[PDB]
A paper describes a structure:
Bacteriophage Casadabanvirus JBD30, from the order Caudoviricetes, is a temperate phage that infects the bacterium Pseudomonas aeruginosa.
The classification, performed as a part of the single-particle reconstruction, identified two classes of JBD30 capsids. The major capsid protein of JBD30 has the canonical HK-97 fold common to tailed bacteriophages and many other viruses. The major capsid protein can be divided into the N-terminal arm, axial domain, peripheral domain, extended loop, and axial loops. Contacts between the pentamers and hexamers are stabilized by the interactions of extended loops, peripheral domains, and N-terminal arms. The extended loop of the major capsid protein stretches over the peripheral domain of the neighbouring subunit positioned clockwise in the same hexamer or pentamer. The three peripheral domains around threefold and pseudo-threefold axes connect either three hexamers, or two hexamers and one pentamer via interactions of α5 helices to form a phenylalanine lock (Phe192). The N-terminal arm extends from the major capsid protein core, protrudes towards the neighbouring capsomer, and forms a small hook that reaches above the spine α-helix.
Author numbering:
A (entry chain B), B (entry chain C): 2 to 51
């Protein structure tokens, strides 16, 4: 006649991490639509002739 | 010739086991819809991070 706190609830229970980091995020797709340009200062300026 | 119909008429037979295992049962399928998580106590508690 063990008291409920020390029962299947807590005393008899094993922790498992099968659900961890299983639901993923949508795959990255920004490369297909955008291109990467590096920078090394506060801003970047672009110019073309015509 | 003449004989009781409970000895010869009963023993003039050849038992065969063709009918055994003639049919089958539906194949296992729960693998395609479930994973197997072994347990070592009364219950298993699961926890994952957000």
């Amino acid at each position: 006649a063990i008291i409920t706190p020390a029962l299947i609830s807590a005393l008899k229970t094993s922790f498992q991490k099968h659900f961890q980091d299983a639901l993923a995020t949508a795959p990255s797709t920004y490369l297909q639509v955008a291109t990467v340009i590096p920078s090394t200062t506060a801003s970047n300026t672009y110019g073309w002739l015509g």
